[PDB]
Design a binder for this molecule. Structure first.
Ligand SMILES: [K+]
Ligand SMILES: [K+]
Ligand SMILES: [Zn+2]
Length: 367
């Protein structure tokens, strides 16, 4: 039984009229219909889940709006109050960083995004479902305890982990973030806390420009329980799989989480505008397969995927579908881009990629 969350409102997120920041006439930044983070990319993934017939092998789970209490397990009261303020504006507004628009009433959608993660987690942890995929929007992993950042309003995977900890009574949860950008928000939230192992694979200094170094290991009781794996631009399937086998899977095995939450972004894809990585749908497939098999071995299969970034409306749907196919074990479609992208490379481990990953292996000893 594989759960699947989509809510119509995930596709209604108002990203405004700019490309990244707001349109600005003096800067001569012309308005544009689709911001880089426009919801159509993720809606096209949902629609392919349905049109491919994959949906027939999934258990649809309705998102439930995250309550203030749910949000407050991950976030400060001032942050929540600030999001209520912006949401109430007649056209919404930027939430602080200059690139994170929330539309009017957009707090409703942020609540449903975090609540989609929580509701899936609840049903997987109870044993009602074996695993699932929450195709939420807006994304979460850049939002630290006290701010929105990098298109993220609330940290969905941390709201879910907080729920699993405080409500479900789980003692150890792992959040594995393979969105191409550093999960700085997740890192922040659990910085001092060994009860949530936070792992981020990312393009080094892609976003944020100042975090994600492997020296960022957590603090106090949390020291050794944050692991960053920064990778060079141009890394593809071979690098990502080398990181999975050499660092991620051993880290999870050492930690023995009771639940694995995957921050599942697809912006490491070969065709993504917001990073320079070379992962293809098959790469994501192999990453999902490895992680799911690890969950089966160490935590009774309890694994929940939660959508983070990804900015190719053309290709992201196939990358996403590949992961969902690994969850259901039922294949619906080939990746029609397979051959086209295969010729471009990324499928050979380069020495600089190997060196970046091997830097992290010594940190495993402290888990
Ligand atoms: K931690
Ligand atoms: K990441
Ligand atoms: Zn991202």
């Amino acid at each position: 039984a594989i759960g699947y969350v989509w809510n119509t409102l995930y596709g209604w997120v108002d990203t405004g009229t700019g490309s990244l920041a707001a349109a600005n006439l003096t800067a001569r930044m012309q308005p544009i219909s689709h911001h880089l983070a426009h919801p159509d990319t993720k809606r096209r993934f949902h629609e392919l889940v349905c049109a491919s017939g994959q949906i027939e092998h999934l258990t649809p789970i309705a998102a439930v709006a995250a309550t203030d209490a749910d949000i407050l397990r991950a976030h400060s009261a001032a942050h929540l109050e600030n999001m209520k303020r912006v949401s109430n504006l007649p056209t919404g507004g930027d939430t602080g960083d200059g690139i994170t628009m929330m539309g009017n009433g957009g707090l409703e959608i942020a609540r449903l995004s975090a609540g989609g993660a929580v509701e899936l987690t609840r049903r997987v942890a109870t044993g009602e479902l074996s695993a699932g995929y929450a195709l939420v929007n807006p994304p979460g992993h850049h939002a630290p305890h006290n701010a929105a950042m990098g298109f993220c309003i609330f940290n969905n995977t941390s709201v879910a982990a907080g729920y699993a900890r405080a409500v479900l009574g789980m003692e150890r949860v792992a959040i594995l973030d393979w969105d191409v950008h550093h999960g700085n928000g997740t890192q922040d939230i659990w910085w001092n806390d060994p009860s949530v192992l936070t792992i981020s694979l990312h393009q080094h200094l892609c976003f944020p420009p100042d975090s994600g170094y492997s020296t960022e290991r957590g603090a106090g009781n949390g020291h050794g329980y944050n692991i960053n794996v920064p990778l060079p631009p141009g890394s593809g399937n071979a690098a990502y799989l080398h990181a999975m086998d050499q660092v991620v899977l051993p880290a999870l095995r050492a930690y023995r989480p009771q639940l694995i939450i995957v921050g599942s972004g697809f912006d490491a894809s070969m065709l993504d505008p917001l990073a320079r990585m070379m992962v293809t749908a098959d790469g994501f497939r192999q990453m999902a397969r490895r992680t799911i098999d690890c969950a089966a071995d160490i935590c009774d299969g309890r694994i929940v995927f939660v959508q983070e970034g990804g900015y190719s409306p053309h290709y992201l749907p196939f990358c996403g579908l590949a992961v969902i196919e690994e969850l259901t074990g039922v294949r619906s479609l080939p990746d029609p881009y397979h051959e086209f992208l295969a010729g471009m490379g990324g499928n050979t481990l380069l020495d600089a990629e190997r060196a970046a990953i091997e830097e992290i292996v010594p940190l495993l000893a402290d888990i």
